Design an enzyme around this catalytic site. Structure first.
Site, PDB file in Angstrom:
ATOM      1  CG  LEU A  69      10.280 -17.005  -1.717  1.00  0.00           C
ATOM      2  CD1 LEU A  69      10.084 -16.856  -0.222  1.00  0.00           C
ATOM      3  CD2 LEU A  69      10.579 -15.659  -2.321  1.00  0.00           C
ATOM      4  CG  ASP A 125      -2.160   0.684   1.183  1.00  0.00           C
ATOM      5  OD1 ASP A 125      -2.828   0.823   2.233  1.00  0.00           O
ATOM      6  OD2 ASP A 125      -2.542   1.103   0.070  1.00  0.00           O
ATOM      7  CG  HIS A 163       3.536   0.781 -10.954  1.00  0.00           C
ATOM      8  ND1 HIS A 163       2.657  -0.161 -10.471  1.00  0.00           N
ATOM      9  CD2 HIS A 163       4.221   0.178 -11.955  1.00  0.00           C
ATOM     10  CE1 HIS A 163       2.802  -1.286 -11.149  1.00  0.00           C
ATOM     11  NE2 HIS A 163       3.745  -1.107 -12.055  1.00  0.00           N
TER      12      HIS A 163
END
EC number: 2.5.1.31
Lengths: 212, 217
Positions: B115, B16, B33
């Site tokens: 991962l 956020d 962004h």
């Protein structure tokens, strides 16, 4: 402005006494006193629903609170309700609950809700089971299984989702409480133990909710 | 910060503050962004080094092309870094451009064993649960399962996170203390850490901090 539904995960009754170097019964006593003060204040503020979840002794708190302060609740127009599998509670606890609901069923003020023997996931599972029943019966179409009709199968069917969720004693977990209902709620975590939570403390939480 | 068996297996983050970060820095929103995308790369590398097994990211008509193109450019590094890409959400309803980039990313990394990086695309907690209910309701009508088989145990099988452990830690940035219809069922017992800084300013130290806090210090 003011939230219609506030939910609180209360605990820290044991820790409060331990830190204060006082017997358990003393923390139990103050805990009940806090429930009483918060109930009156919320009612005065115009809150419509107040859901309480006591996270041994805390197991007795609800029943003990109801048996002890019911007359006050009746006087102040408070309606008592519950969420959870109440029919599975110890007799003397189930007794106090049934009696409080019966005697306050006509009140139109603040609805005080106690989450007893409640669990978010199990609540969901129960709803799913009911929905499955209706579908197999042809009562509903697969299109009717939407998030708009899902609330109808939950314990909180007749009530709005909490705008604000509060947890005491620091802890920052949901603890399987109001899983679906609090999906968009504002979470406010305060470090103070339940017995120290007061009117002022509640205003700060609301202030935060409002100023955000 | 104890690097031992105190490292969470699954960390979920709600990204956020990309826009608000840009306005404060007096820059166009688009620049927020990209800085945020850089943050995604930094954290993926770091998390991978820490030993975290799962990392779920949730972002919170060119805009429709951004997620897909980010993957295309990051993929080369993900491949060599032994990262496995996965998704949760209705990717089937995503724009062709992004749907393609996504399907390619999973295919070219399906054999990696490090991962597992999960992208929550076109995801919604409530919607996820509703989908599972329909599946179960259909399975019940067909007579394939009994009413008693509808338990908390078997419920995970119908969610997007069926082959995944619930997250032990959930992080949200921008200092916004609120859950946004994300991993509703999966975060029942997860620890919540709401940090104040914007996603673009979030870094390795911030992650380390959150983990320290998770470890109850």
């Amino acid at each position: 402005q003011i939230p219609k539904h506030i939910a609180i995960i209360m605990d820290g009754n044991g820790r409060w006494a331990k830190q204060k170097k006082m017997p358990r019964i003393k923390g139990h006593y103050e805990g009940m006193q806090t429930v009483r003060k918060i109930t009156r204040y919320a009612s005065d503020l115009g809150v419509k629903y107040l859901t309480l979840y006591a996270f041994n002794y805390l197991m007795k708190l609800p029943g003990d609170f109801l048996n002890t302060f019911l007359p006050e609740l009746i006087e102040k127009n408070v309606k008592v309700e519950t969420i959870g599998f109440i029919d599975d509670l110890p007799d003397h606890t189930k007794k106090a609950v049934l009696e409080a609901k019966e005697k306050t069923k006509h009140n139109t003020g603040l609805t005080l809700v106690f989450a007893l023997n409640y669990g978010g996931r199990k609540e969901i599972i129960s709803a799913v089971q009911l929905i499955a029943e209706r579908y197999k019966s042809g009562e509903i179409s697969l299109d009717e299984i939407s998030e708009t009709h899902f609330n109808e199968y939950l314990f909180t069917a007749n009530m709005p989702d909490p705008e604000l969720l509060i947890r005491t004693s620091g802890e920052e977990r949901l603890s399987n409480f109001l899983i679906w209902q609090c999906s968009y709620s504002e979470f406010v975590f305060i470090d103070e133990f339940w017995p120290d939570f007061n009117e002022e403390s509640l205003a700060q939480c609301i202030s935060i909710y409002q100023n955000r």
